[PDB]
Curated annotation (Swiss-Prot), chain A:
Residues 1-30 form a coiled coil. Subunit of the fusion protein that is processed upon entry into the host cell. Mediates fusion of the virion and cellular membranes by functioning as a class I viral fusion protein. Contains a viral fusion peptide that is unmasked after S2 cleavage. This cleavage can occur at the cell membrane by host TMPRSS2 or during endocytosis by host CSTL. In either case, this triggers an extensive and irreversible conformational change that leads to fusion of the viral envelope with the cellular cytoplasmic membrane, releasing viral genomic RNA into the host cell cytoplasm. The chain holds residues 964 to 1012 of 1273 of the full protein. It comes from Severe acute respiratory syndrome coronavirus 2 (2019-nCoV). The gene is S. It comes from the Viruses. This is Spike protein S2'.
Swiss-Prot record, chain B:
Changing F126L: In strain: A23.1, Omicron/BA.2.75. It comes from the Viruses. The chain holds residues 14 to 413 of 1273 of the full protein. Glycans are attached at N4, N48, N101, N134, N191, N230, T271, S273, N279, N291. This is Spike protein S1. Changing Q39H: In strain: Omicron/EG.5.1. Residues 351-353 are annotated as: Integrin-binding motif. Disulfide bonds join C2-C115, C110-C135, C239-C249, C284-C309.
Length: 49, 361, 100, 100
């Protein structure tokens, strides 16, 4: 379910951000989404450990 | 002054292997007893390369390359003299020329006029070009130089930098490892999309000695390189050649222990598009809000809902007949690729002092 | 220009191909402005006429409705996985095995 | 006099190299753009002519050659580290000891 989290971005779909935003802001939104997913996966890894 | 060649004999090019060739220093970093993996244009191992033989066989081919040509040749009596680099090999564009007579090398890039069959010919004849019109570059360096010698050369063009990697060793390609150290860096900063090989003829019509050279293709991939305690490169590992070297690259070690290891994942690459939406019977009348006979004011604009049609955004993004086009919440580059239900076009006239106000918040 | 983008069945697309369905080919596509990569197979789902696209638990598109054809065209039910390498030590030998 | 800004690789630049060097001291040197702090120490290793600056396991500039002088200098950081204080309870006394 964390894949559907917007994480403060315009949309929760990667291809939507890639096709629906200019690259200077598209890279910002992609970086925000991947760091949110990295934080979520770090939390999952800590819980699993 | 150029002389055409008629006695050429037709023969298709041959192919040989690239077992342990094409390795070079990616940068100028000194390391001591560590294994480092880096991304750079590197020749894959066990890749097929083109072999040309000169004997009465004459091999002067023209092939388009962007960058990264690996030139290896077994050499005796200095048959190979010069090289040609450029885009169209004429006076309309700048072309890079390498020459080397019995004294020293000369590196020059110019809009030289190149004939169809340029070559070299005691050597005192120099017939490779006719005139120079638009150039000012000049560079002079020290001379670089049964089969007895093997010469390998790598030419690269990244970020306007012409990197030359050379290595001379005394001796098909022999089975061995030899790291090609860089020789000289040329800050040319032009484009090159063609090359031509120059050969030297012996006069005693004309006779040509036994020579052979190899042409290779450079590909972007990750190589795991080993730097010894004294800084020289000992071995190379391709991370995408075989699963053994894949495990070596993943574990960052040249020796893998016994057991099950995970390196990467298997994926199916896309090949074709099955986009499934039949096109709409009419086109979008974008000229209604652009070529209207009259416009509305900023406080009370005119909204025309444009929907159920096929749009063309090349006149807005690709072409610029208008003063300023800008998109905040949508990509201006991929405007035609998207699919929306309806668009509300607000047409109004604003003075140049307040046109910056049309933005979110 | 204000875009009601990916909130309703879209009708404004410049280039299109309208390719028919194909099996066992997990490749890219673009359905009404939504991009994906997968096979386009059949299903036994009985979709109501007003329904256009379905969604799974992860809010990922798994169904669509194609105008002028009225078919399923399932969204990305294609195979994927990882590859594992099994080999002994380098001192003994160098043979490797590929496992999916 | 006319110039061109952002059109080709640049070679014409003014002199910003501080006109002097440091031996046996850790300073914030600027070697052609990179900024680092360390003591310039003579290195017994042999450096190939094309090499300019080396990197350690930390991917930091631990070795460099001078842009003009052919001599090679190693970058070693000067004295740095944590410091701890050993003291008894405040009710007993107030004498303290410093330890690095
Ligand atoms: C030789 O090169 C050709 C393409 O030029 C390629 O199709 C062929 O597989 C290569 N041979 C080997 C043994 O890889
Ligand atoms: C070799 O070429 C250079 C290029 O300018 C020239 O100056 C030199 O005289 C040449 N040497 C001989 C022996 O012709
Ligand atoms: C002619 O040469 C000058 C100076 O080298 C250069 O700026 C100009 O672009 C050249 N013209 C053409 C058509 O190449
Ligand atoms: C590559 O060469 C072509 C040949 O005319 C030229 O038009 C193009 O500008 C070059 N690319 C770059 C990045 O200069
Ligand atoms: C739409 O597709 C039809 C063919 O089905 C074609 O004739 C027409 O020119 C295309 N353009 C429109 C009307 O969008
Ligand atoms: C209005 O201007 C556009 C762009 O120049 C042109 O294509 C069109 O034919 C003109 N007339 C109308 C009625 O749209
Ligand atoms: C490595 O270099 C040192 C001097 O820098 C030399 O004494 C030593 O012999 C070299 N190693 C080998 C294996 O030759």
């Amino acid at each position: 379910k964390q894949l559907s989290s917007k994480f403060g971005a315009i949309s929760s779909v990667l291809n939507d951000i890639f096709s629906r935003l200019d690259p200077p802001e598209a890279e910002v939104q992609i970086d925000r989404l991947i760091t949110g997913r990295l934080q979520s996966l770090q939390t999952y890894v800590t819980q699993q450990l | 002054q150029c002389v055409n060649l008629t006695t050429r004999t037709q023969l298709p090019p041959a192919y040989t292997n690239s077992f342990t060739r094409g390795v070079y220093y990616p940068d100028k970093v000194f390391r001591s007893s560590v294994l480092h993996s880096t991304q750079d244009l590197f020749l894959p191992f066990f890749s097929n390369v083109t072999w040309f033989h000169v004997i009465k066989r004459f091999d002067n081919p023209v092939l388009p390359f962007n960058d990264g040509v690996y030139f290896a040749s077994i050499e005796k009596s200095n048959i190979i003299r010069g090289w040609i680099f450029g885009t169209t090999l004429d006076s309309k564009t700048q072309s890079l020329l390498i020459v080397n007579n019995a004294t020293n090398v000369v590196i020059k890039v110019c809009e030289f006029q190149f004939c169809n069959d340029p070559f070299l010919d005691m050597e005192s004849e120099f017939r490779v070009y006719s005139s120079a019109n638009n150039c000012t570059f000049e560079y002079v360096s020290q001379p670089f130089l049964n089969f007895k010698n093997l010469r390998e050369f790598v030419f690269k063009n990244i970020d306007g930098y012409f990197k030359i990697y050379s290595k001379h060793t005394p001796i098909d390609l022999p089975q061995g490892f030899s790291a090609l150290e860089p020789l000289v860096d040329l800050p040319i900063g032009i484009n090159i999309t063609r090359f031509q090989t120059l050969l030297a003829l012996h006069r005693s019509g004309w006779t040509a000695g036994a020579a052979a050279y190899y042409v290779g293709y450079l590909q972007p991939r990750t190589f795991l390189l080993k730097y010894n305690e004294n800084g020289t490169i000992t071995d190379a590992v391709d991370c995408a050649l075989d699963p053994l070297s894949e495990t070596k690259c993943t574990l960052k070690s040249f020796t893998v222990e016994k057991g099950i290891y995970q390196t990467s994942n298997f994926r199916v690459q896309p090949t074709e598009s099955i986009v499934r939406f039949p096109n709409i019977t009419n086109l979008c009348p974008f000229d209604e809000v652009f070529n209207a006979t009259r416009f509305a004011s900023v406080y009370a604009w005119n909204r025309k809902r444009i929907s159920n049609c096929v749009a063309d955004y090349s006149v807005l993004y690709n072409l610029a007949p208008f003063f300023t086009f800008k998109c905040y919440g949508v990509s201006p580059t991929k405007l035609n690729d998207l699919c929306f239900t309806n668009v509300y076009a607000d047409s109004f006239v604003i003075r140049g002092d307040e046109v910056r106000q049309i933005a979110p918040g | 220009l204000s875009f009601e983008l990916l909130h309703a069945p879209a009708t404004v697309c410049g280039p299109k191909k309208s390719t028919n369905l194909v099996k066992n080919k997990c490749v890219n596509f673009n359905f009404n402005g939504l991009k994906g990569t997968g096979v386009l197979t059949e299903s036994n789902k009985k979709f109501l006429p007003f329904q256009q696209f379905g969604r799974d638990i992860a809010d990922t598109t798994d169904a669509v409705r194609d105008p002028q054809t009225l078919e399923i065209l399932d969204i990305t039910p294609c195979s994927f996985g990882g590859v594992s390498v099994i080999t002994p030590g380098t001192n003994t030998s160098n043979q490797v095995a590929v496992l999916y």
